[PDB]
Amino acid sequence: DIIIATKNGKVRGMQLTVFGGTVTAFLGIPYAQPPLGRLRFKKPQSLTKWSDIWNATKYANSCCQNIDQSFPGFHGSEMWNPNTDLSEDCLYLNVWIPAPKPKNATVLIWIYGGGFQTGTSSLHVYDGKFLARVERVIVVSMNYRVGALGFLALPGNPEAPGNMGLFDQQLALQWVQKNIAAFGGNPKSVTLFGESAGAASVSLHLLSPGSHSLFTRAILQSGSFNAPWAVTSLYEARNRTLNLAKLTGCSRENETEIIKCLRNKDPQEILLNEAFVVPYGTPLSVNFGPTVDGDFLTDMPDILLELGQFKKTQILVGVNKDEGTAFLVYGAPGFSKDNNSIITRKEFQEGLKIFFPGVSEFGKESILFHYTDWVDDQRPENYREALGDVVGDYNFICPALEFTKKFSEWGNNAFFYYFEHRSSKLPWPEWMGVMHGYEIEFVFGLPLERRDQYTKAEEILSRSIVKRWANFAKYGNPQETQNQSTSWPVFKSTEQKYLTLNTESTRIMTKLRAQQCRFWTSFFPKV
Numbered sequence: 133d134i135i136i137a138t139k140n141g142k143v144r145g146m147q148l149t150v151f152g153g154t155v156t157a158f159l160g161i162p163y164a165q166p167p168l169g170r171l172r173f174k175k176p177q178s179l180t181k182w183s184d185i186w187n188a189t190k191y192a193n194s195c196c197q198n199i200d201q202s203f204p205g206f207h208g209s210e211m212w213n214p215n216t217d218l219s220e221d222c223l224y225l226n227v228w229i230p231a232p233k234p235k236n237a238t239v240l241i242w243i244y245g246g247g248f249q250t251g252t253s254s255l256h257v258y259d260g261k262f263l264a265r266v267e268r269v270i271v272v273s274m275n276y277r278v279g280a281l282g283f284l285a286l287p288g289n290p291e292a293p294g295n296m297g298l299f300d301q302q303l304a305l306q307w308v309q310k311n312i313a314a315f316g317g318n319p320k321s322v323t324l325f326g327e328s329a330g331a332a333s334v335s336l337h338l339l340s341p342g343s344h345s346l347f348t349r350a351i352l353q354s355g356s357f358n359a360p361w362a363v364t365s366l367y368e369a370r371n372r373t374l375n376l377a378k379l380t381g382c383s384r385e386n387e388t389e390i391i392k393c394l395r396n397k398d399p400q401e402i403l404l405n406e407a408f409v410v411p412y413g414t415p416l417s418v419n420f421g422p423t424v425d426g427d428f429l430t431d432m433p434d435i436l437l438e439l440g441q442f443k444k445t446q447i448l449v450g451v452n453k454d455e456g457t458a459f460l461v462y463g464a465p466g467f468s469k470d471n472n473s474i475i476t477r478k479e480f481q482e483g484l485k486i487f488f489p490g491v492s493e494f495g496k497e498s499i500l501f502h503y504t505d506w507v508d509d510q511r512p513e514n515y516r517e518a519l520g521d522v523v524g525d526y527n528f529i530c531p532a533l534e535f536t537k538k539f540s541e542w543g544n545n546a547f548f549y550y551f552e553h554r555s556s557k558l559p560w561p562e563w564m565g566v567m568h569g570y571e572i573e574f575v576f577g578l579p580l581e582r583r584d585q586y587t588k589a590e591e592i593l594s595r596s597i598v599k600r601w602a603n604f605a606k607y608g609n610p611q612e613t614q615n616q617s618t619s620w621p622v623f624k625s626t627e628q629k630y631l632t633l634n635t636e637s638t639r640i641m642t643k644l645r646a647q648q649c650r651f652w653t654s655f656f657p658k659v
């Protein structure tokens with residue numbers, strides 16, 4: 133029987149067998165007053181202590197969210213949907229600790245992604261028990277509010293100030309600061325990592341003064357706040373908050389009375405109207421996301437990045453070979469997961485309108501011009517592969533590259549990876565390649581489970597990635613020192629070296645997507 137005394141009460145865990153050893157899991161520890169009633173849309177409030185023994189023995193509720201229902205019965209999409217009840221009462225976190233209890237273990241904190249509209253810490257690809265068993269780090273993950281319940285903004289107004297979900301994450305980092313030592317963790321050796329919206333979150337914690345003292349190092353997988361989907365303007369945030377109020381019959385004159393009105397609606401009416409607060413948005417539109425609130429975020433984050441106003445520490449940043457392909461079947465004409473999605477020039481051009489809705493005619497012609505000068509105009513998948521690269525380069529790879537370049541110019545060590553292994557178990561079609569999100573399971577060491585039908589080469593790749601990530605957390609340096617591995621060089625803005633992750637041979641390359649990112653980073657923002 134394992135019971136830890138925390139600052140707010142006792143908590144009881146459970147033991148798990150992992151690889152012939154033991155991990156102690158504390159699932160579903162609350163870290164905040166449940167944000168219900170007059171607390172909906174406000175910053176997370178601190179936790180009133182309890183005297184009982186909280187049984188932290190099952191994952192808690194996931195936060196309210198709309199569910200991906202685009203492929204019913206399909207594991208490739210449904211494995212990302214929540215696996216616990218949805219509830220506004222969802223401010224809980226999980227803790228995996230090695231057994232026997234470590235003495236002063238490095239802590240890894242996971243922040244899931246999901247477009248800031250979905251996600252939950254209880255997905256099985258986020259299960260922290262392998263990392264605690266194999267690397268003897270402590271793994272923590274938390275649920276944070278998403279969608280309008282997490283990011284509805286009336287900037288200035290504390291009834292709905294924006295960024296509530298980011299403050300949920302922040303209050304969880306504070307909880308680790310105040311409690312993780314009781315579990316054998318080192319509060320001074322805390323690494324944040326996350327993917328997609330989670331990675332963009334991590335990068336915003338690097339800018340936020342209130343998080344400066346809450347973590348040591350940061351890892352950003354396929355995401356950074358300067359991606360074009362990661363930050364909402366104050367103009368959009370207001371236009372979207374008012375649109376939501378109109379659609380719910382809540383639009384008033386006194387802003388505080390709109391919030392009071394929105395507080396009496398049931399989550400489902402809020403959820404069902406979220407989709408339409410944007411007149412013309414991309415697929416999976418980030419309706420409600422981070423804003424410049426003057427609290428978590430003091431200025432436009434591009435300005436903070438450009439002028440060195442962020443935490444000085446090491447970062448590990450990376451992307452996947454085919455970031456864009458997964459999004460093409462959520463609205464691009466001519467695409468399907470169930471055929472090879474060979475599209476025409478006209479279909480390509482229609483796709484640009486789908487994924488660049490507000491953009492001028494000239495703007496979309498400039499995208500076409502730069503991605504359609506063919507090595508071979510007779511190849512039939514030309515337009516299918518160009519559209520994926522367009523979405524991937526614009527939304528993930530080039531912003532991540534630009535974030536790393538700008539961040540390292542202020543002197544800190546940065547390491548950049550390029551993940552290019554397609555999972556042998558991947559259920560999506562082969563034309564999607566090395567998909568967004570399908571490195572996570574390698575990071576969490578799922579292929580270390582020989583029962584799970586991964587190949588041997590994938591077990592070795594996962595083991596190497598898990599060592600590099602852990603060595604980055606512990607020591608600030610993502611090396612595998614014992615197995616004659618390729619040394620991972622620091623990323624510098626002059627040379628721009630990066631490391632490729634694959635099953636065969638790990639390589640040092642330079643200047644990923646150089647031609648494409650000069651287009652997206654220097655030209656396209658003008659249009």
Ligand SMILES: COC[C@@H]1CCCN(CCNC(=O)c2cc3nn(CC4CCCCC4)cc3cc2Oc2ccc(F)cc2F)C1
Binds near residue numbers: 200249417
């Ligand atoms: C991506 O779709 C299939 C994947 C397989 C692997 C990871 N995904 C699971 C993890 N969620 C994501 O990665 C996620 C990434 C996103 N980026 N944005 C901005 C912008 C949108 C236009 C193009 C470029 C980026 C919006 C996103 C929504 C996402 O979450 C989903 C939410 C509701 C849903 F109905 C389906 C979702 F995905 C499921």
Ligand SMILES: *[C@@H]1O[C@H](CO[C@@H]2O[C@@H](C)[C@@H](O)[C@@H](O)[C@@H]2O)[C@@H](O[C@@H]2O[C@H](CO)[C@@H](O)[C@H](O)[C@H]2NC(C)=O)[C@H](O)[C@H]1NC(C)=O
Binds near residue numbers: 371378379410411
């Ligand atoms: C700010 O929002 C208005 C509100 O229009 C919304 O449109 C519906 C789809 C739904 O979300 C409702 O709650 C809102 O009324 C936008 O006005 C629309 O603009 C488009 C083109 O920009 C036009 O075709 C529509 O006819 C407009 N609809 C109405 C009802 O006025 C407005 O454009 C938004 N502002 C910006 C800069 O995008």
Ligand SMILES: *[C@@H]1O[C@H](CO[C@@H]2O[C@@H](C)[C@@H](O)[C@@H](O)[C@@H]2O)[C@@H](O[C@@H]2O[C@H](CO)[C@@H](O)[C@H](O)[C@H]2NC(C)=O)[C@H](O)[C@H]1NC(C)=O
Binds near residue numbers: 464465470
């Ligand atoms: C690939 O499939 C898309 C999607 O079509 C659906 O999925 C298929 C697997 C099959 O079950 C179809 O009957 C379904 O309609 C095809 O695109 C559609 O093409 C039709 C007719 O040509 C057109 O009217 C629709 O609007 C298209 N739908 C979309 C979403 O684009 C596509 O043609 C198929 N391509 C190849 C090369 O096989």
Ligand SMILES: *[C@@H]1O[C@H](CO[C@@H]2O[C@@H](C)[C@@H](O)[C@@H](O)[C@@H]2O)[C@@H](O)[C@H](O)[C@H]1NC(C)=O
Binds near residue numbers: 236318320321348606
């Ligand atoms: C635990 O260790 C502390 C120092 O941790 C180390 O220094 C920090 C700044 C990080 O770089 C981190 O990665 C290092 O591991 C001690 O100050 C502390 O007292 C120790 N506590 C114990 C052993 O109970």
Ligand SMILES: *[C@@H]1O[C@H](CO)[C@@H](O)[C@H](O)[C@H]1NC(C)=O
Binds near residue numbers: 185187
């Ligand atoms: C926690 O679990 C133990 C049994 O393992 C039980 O005695 C106790 O009542 C539980 N606490 C609850 C249900 O709150």
Ligand SMILES: *[C@@H]1O[C@H](CO)[C@@H](O)[C@H](O)[C@H]1NC(C)=O
Binds near residue numbers: 386387388389
């Ligand atoms: C709006 O209503 C709130 C809540 O009663 C009140 O405190 C505030 O002063 C009002 N402001 C205006 C401008 O009507």
Ligand SMILES: *[C@@H]1O[C@H](CO)[C@@H](O)[C@H](O)[C@H]1NC(C)=O
Binds near residue numbers: 599612614615
């Ligand atoms: C190093 O190599 C051995 C086999 O030589 C392998 O079993 C082990 O897991 C490897 N370790 C890492 C950290 O990659």
Ligand SMILES: [Cl-]
Binds near residue numbers: 196218219400
């Ligand atoms: Cl609900």
Ligand SMILES: [Cl-]
Binds near residue numbers: 477509
């Ligand atoms: Cl052509």
Ligand SMILES: [Cl-]
Binds near residue numbers: 646
């Ligand atoms: Cl260059």
